[PDB]
């Protein structure tokens, strides 16, 4: 099946899902003297107090910290959106080195790791009807640069243990989400798509100006992961991230 590696890697995702050479594919290099500065854009609203996190499991391709979106617990609006998105999951994309590891570039520099938040807009009631329509979800992505530790992260860092190959669960309860935000909400925007197959159109990108920083120690242990299943050869999870593709014509817009 699909994967990251030579035989199977987003070079071949086509075959098995042809809109991979579509028109609002992610990721994107972000050209910042190209971005245009909207000022009818409004200041995200990110409500986060009430999130409650179930578990963490590793799919074989990352690792999902998962939450109850059975209510509008921890939700996001404002920025570009229309709506309430209700947040799902969270995952990261990172590299084998320090050198890359994030989907997304600015100004074509590459960074350690990229955190995505993704969440689904409630008029379409569950994430499986979200994702087959053009404004279904909302993805907030966060860039990683290796420096100092970042507190908030470390919860996540020392569960990995557990959730070592593909399959593998565990409870993850009372984990905040807040403390992997950034101290600014500025942003960049377009409208694009999920950065793994299925590859649907559904989404629209907010990402992040500002970095959080995390410890080279703290990287280190997102690589220990494995994609194969428990008894398998085993494979590093590393380098799990898509390259930039076209922008076709899409317009990047700027809160600032
Ligand atoms: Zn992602």
Same mark, same amino acid.
């Given at each position: 099946?699909?994967?990251?590696?030579?035989?199977?890697?987003?070079?071949?995702?086509?075959?098995?899902?042809?809109?991979?050479? %579509?028109?609002?594919?992610?990721? @994107?290099?972000?050209?910042?003297?190209? !971005?245009?500065?909207?000022?009818? &854009? #409004?200041?995200? +609203?990110?409500?986060?107090?009430?999130?409650?996190?179930?578990?963490?499991?590793?799919?074989?391709?990352?690792?999902?910290?998962?939450?109850?979106?059975?209510?509008?617990?921890?939700?996001?609006?404002?920025?570009?959106?229309?709506?309430?998105?209700?947040?799902?999951?969270?995952?990261?994309?990172?590299?084998?080195?320090?050198?890359?590891?994030?989907?997304?570039?600015?100004?074509?520099?590459?960074?350690?790791?990229?955190?995505?938040?993704?969440?689904?807009?409630?008029?379409? %009631?569950?994430?499986?009807?979200? @994702?087959?329509?053009?404004?279904?979800? !909302?993805?907030?992505?966060?860039? &990683? #640069?290796?420096? +100092?530790?970042?507190?908030?992260?470390?919860?996540?860092?020392?569960?990995?243990?557990?959730?070592?190959?593909?399959?593998?669960?565990?409870?993850?309860?009372?984990?905040?989400?807040?403390?992997?935000?950034?101290?600014?909400?500025?942003?960049?925007?377009?409208?694009?798509?999920?950065?793994?197959?299925?590859?649907?159109?559904?989404?629209?990108?907010?990402?992040?100006?500002?970095?959080?920083?995390?410890?080279?120690?703290?990287?280190?242990?997102?690589?220990?992961?494995?994609?194969?299943?428990?008894?398998?050869?085993?494979?590093?999870?590393?380098?799990?991230?898509?390259?930039?593709?076209? &922008? #076709?014509?899409?317009?990047?817009?700027?809160?600032?």
């Amino acid at each position: 099946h699909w994967g990251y590696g030579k035989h199977n890697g987003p070079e071949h995702w086509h075959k098995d899902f042809p809109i991979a050479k %579509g028109e609002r594919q992610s990721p @994107v290099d972000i050209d910042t003297h190209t !971005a245009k500065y909207d000022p009818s &854009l #409004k200041p995200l +609203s990110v409500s986060y107090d009430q999130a409650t996190s179930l578990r963490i499991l590793n799919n074989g391709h990352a690792f999902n910290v998962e939450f109850d979106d059975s209510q509008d617990k921890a939700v996001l609006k404002g920025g570009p959106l229309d709506g309430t998105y209700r947040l799902i999951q969270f995952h990261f994309h990172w590299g084998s080195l320090d050198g890359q590891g994030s989907e997304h570039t600015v100004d074509k520099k590459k960074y350690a790791a990229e955190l995505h938040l993704v969440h689904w807009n409630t008029k379409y %009631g569950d994430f499986g009807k979200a @994702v087959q329509q053009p404004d279904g979800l !909302a993805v907030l992505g966060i860039f &990683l #640069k290796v420096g +100092s530790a970042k507190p908030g992260l470390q919860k996540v860092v020392d569960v990995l243990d557990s959730i070592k190959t593909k399959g593998k669960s565990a409870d993850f309860t009372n984990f905040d989400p807040r403390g992997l935000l950034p101290e600014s909400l500025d942003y960049w925007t377009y409208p694009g798509s999920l950065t793994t197959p299925p590859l649907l159109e559904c989404v629209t990108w907010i990402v992040l100006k500002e970095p959080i920083s995390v410890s080279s120690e703290q990287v280190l242990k997102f690589r220990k992961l494995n994609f194969n299943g428990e008894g398998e050869p085993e494979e590093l999870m590393v380098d799990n991230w898509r390259p930039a593709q076209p &922008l #076709k014509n899409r317009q990047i817009k700027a809160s600032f």
